[PDB]
Amino acid sequence: SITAITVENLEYPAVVTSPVTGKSYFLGGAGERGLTIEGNFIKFTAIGVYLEDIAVASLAAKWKGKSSEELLETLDFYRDIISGPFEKLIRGSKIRELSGPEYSRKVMENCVAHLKSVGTYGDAEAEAMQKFAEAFKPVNFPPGASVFYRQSPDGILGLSFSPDTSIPEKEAALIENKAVSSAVLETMIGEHAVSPDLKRCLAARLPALLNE
Numbered sequence: 001s002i003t004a005i006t007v008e009n010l011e012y013p014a015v016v017t018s019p020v021t022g023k024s025y026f027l028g029g030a031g032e033r034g035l036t037i038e039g040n041f042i043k044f045t046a047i048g049v050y051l052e053d054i055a056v057a058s059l060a061a062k063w064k065g066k067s068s069e070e071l072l073e074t075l076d077f078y079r080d081i082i083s084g085p086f087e088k089l090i091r092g093s094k095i096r097e098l099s100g101p102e103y104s105r106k107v108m109e110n111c112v113a114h115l116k117s118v119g120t121y122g123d124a125e126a127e128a129m130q131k132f133a134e135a136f137k138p139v140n141f142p143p144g145a146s147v148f149y150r151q152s153p154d155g156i157l158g159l160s161f162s163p164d165t166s167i168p169e170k171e172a173a174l175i176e177n178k179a180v181s182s183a184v185l186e187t188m189i190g191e192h193a194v195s196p197d198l199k200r201c202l203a204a205r206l207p208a209l210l211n212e
């Protein structure tokens with residue numbers, strides 16, 4: 001009984017299948033990001049986090065039979081989602097037009113702070129983050145355009161860009177670095193991600209699947 005979610009007229013299908021991997025994923029949650037200007041929340045993007053179908057069996061061991069309220073306050077639960085042995089697919093769709101460098105600047109900031117935070121920001125991670133930046137330089141995201149982060153459990157982060165919300169056929173780049181590969185999702189649902197919309201969605205939707 002997995003449903004879809006619409007955010008500012010941007011829809012996130014309940015389930016999806018990738019042309020690049022051939023696996024299928026279910027919508028784990030959705031929400032929105034932006035900037036708070038003069039006390040006002042200014043929306044710029046919508047975010048959807050998908051989990052590989054096999055994430056259920058994996059998470060079932062430790063989190064089956066827990067209330068949504070209980071999962072939401074448990075950090076270890078989100079750590080399993082972030083680093084669990086399955087792919088996570090994040091799709092960010094624009095509400096307001098941002099150039100590749102405009103959008104990527106803040107993402108990279110949050111990722112670098114996290115990486116330095118946990119002591120995993122050496123030359124390799126720096127180089128990987130530069131490659132990350134390099135991939136965004138040639139693109140522009142008008143309203144509706146999307147960015148796809150494919151977090152492979154094998155320590156690789158795949159980057160895709162779409163004129164709209166349909167999954168691209170090929171990936172634009174592969175960031176091969178373990179620490180960086182999970183940094184992006186970390187800044188969305190990790191312990192130091194202020195916005196709880198995504199975290200709450202995960203707590204509210206997962207319990208159902210874990211029980212069957």
Ligand SMILES: O=C1C[C@@H](c2ccccc2)Oc2cc(O)ccc21
Binds near residue numbers: 034044103184
């Ligand atoms: O989904 C977004 C929006 C993006 C953003 C939005 C508006 C202006 C600059 C950057 O910031 C982010 C930073 C992150 O670590 C993760 C996700 C996002």
